[PDB]
């Protein structure tokens, strides 16, 4: 059997940001979907590839497990075929994606009284990324008329820290999102 280490993702107590999502390739282990039931109350447990009831009966050669924390309104953009600031510059899924997206509320775990600034998202960029590709470039973004190459006039950094505090609205509260990608 040797069940897959799902506890290391859903119960890591140290999550990666959306621009550096912790890609974990699931292989050589039986996908035990029982721990997914206990690790979350299933806020946005919605699949697009296969039905959840027959998850344990299928067979896959390559399975991916991503993880990233975003605001509440940005979870609806993790579905295949969306456009925004997270579905374009931080994360991308193909149109024929076969998997499930697990999102739940972590306002009591990722929100600090003085503000949890460890979560940043890329707001603006020139072009949009490719599915399952990362962008950890810290080079400042150019938006002005002349090449600035400091953050001078109309030149800003692409990242931006999340407004996560326990008093923020549930739309802006930290929502930990997990994606179980499958390949046939």
């Amino acid at each position, epitope marked *: 059997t040797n069940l897959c280490p799902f506890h290391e993702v859903f119960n890591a107590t140290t999550f990666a940001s959306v621009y550096a999502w912790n890609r974990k390739r699931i292989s050589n282990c039986v996908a035990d979907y029982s721990v997914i039931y206990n690790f979350a*109350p299933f*806020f946005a447990f919605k699949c697009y590839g296969v039905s959840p009831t027959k998850l344990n009966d299928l067979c896959f050669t390559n399975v991916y497990a991503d993880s990233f924390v975003i605001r509440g309104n940005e979870v609806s953009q993790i579905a295949p075929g969306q456009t925004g600031n997270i579905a374009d510059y931080n994360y991308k899924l193909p149109d024929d994606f076969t998997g499930c997206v697990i999102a*739940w*509320n972590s*306002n*009591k775990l990722d929100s600090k*009284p*003085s503000g949890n600034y460890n979560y940043l998202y890329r707001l603006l960029r020139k072009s949009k990324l490719k599915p399952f590709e990362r962008d950890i470039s810290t080079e400042i973004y150019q938006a002005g008329n002349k090449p600035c190459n400091v953050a001078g006039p109309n030149c800003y950094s692409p990242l931006q820290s999340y407004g996560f*505090r*326990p*008093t*923020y*609205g*549930v*739309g*802006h509260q930290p929502y930990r999102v997990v994606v179980l990608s499958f390949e046939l």
Partner: antibody
């Protein structure tokens, strides 16, 4: 409009627990962007916040009434209850249930209140 | 630890203006919202001011709120008082640890 109503025994004994229920008529406990709260008020004193809870399970309590309160929700009948254990004679008060707005980018006003229920913890 | 301290009693004759206040002893008062609730004796509280400036539907224009971050306090300005305005006005806000902090309570009494 949305309205709330408290219900429970109007007389308790020490070393026991106080259990009240707040049936939500006109709304839905399933609705997010809202915290379901319980408020306390001793006779002749000011309001005292007991705690609220999000329908997803995020429970926030008063730092003084911790380890003695327990608020839960029931999606079946659109109700949420209060469980205040280890009651003493000083817990005689009028108990209110209210909901708070958590949609406008921050936690906000207690938009809808109940009607008030008086309990007398006596021995 | 975040507190709100209101005056114990405020009283002005009709057609005058009262200013119920509340000072945040700890924390800050601009970092969260400040709401004001009116509780008549024998009834439930009622929102009169939310988002620190706005009045809910049905609330008359005689009420108005304000926030001063220099002194770390809030206020509830009421003008043109009438016989139905005398009630207990509470100053409610939040701590950054997500704790609803109510004020001690100000019993407004319109003199007759």
């Amino acid at each position: 409009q949305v309205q709330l109503q408290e219900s429970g025994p109007g007389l308790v004994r020490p070393s026991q627990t106080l259990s009240l229920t707040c049936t939500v008529s006109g709304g839905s406990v399933r609705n997010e962007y809202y915290y379901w709260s319980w408020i306390r008020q001793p006779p002749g004193q000011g309001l005292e916040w007991i705690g609220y809870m999000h329908n997803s399970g995020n429970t926030y309590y008063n730092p003084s009434l911790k380890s003695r309160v327990a608020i839960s929700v029931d999606m079946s009948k659109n109700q949420f209850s209060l469980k205040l254990s280890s009651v003493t004679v000083a817990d005689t008060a009028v108990y209110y249930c209210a909901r708070v707005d958590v949609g406008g980018t921050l936690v906000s006003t207690f938009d809808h209140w109940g009607q008030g229920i008086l309990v007398t913890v006596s021995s | 630890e975040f507190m709100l301290t209101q005056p114990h009693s405020v009283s002005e004759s009709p057609e005058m203006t009262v200013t119920i206040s509340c000072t945040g002893s700890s924390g800050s008062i601009a970092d969260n919202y400040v709401q004001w609730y009116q509780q008549r004796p024998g009834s439930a509280p009622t929102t009169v001011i939310y988002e620190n400036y706005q009045r809910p539907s049905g609330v008359p224009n005689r009420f108005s709120g304000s926030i001063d971050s220099s002194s770390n306090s809030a206020s509830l300005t009421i003008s043109g008082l009438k016989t139905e305005d005398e009630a207990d006005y509470y100053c409610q806000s939040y701590d950054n640890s997500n704790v609803a902090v109510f004020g001690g309570g100000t019993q407004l009494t319109v003199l007759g």
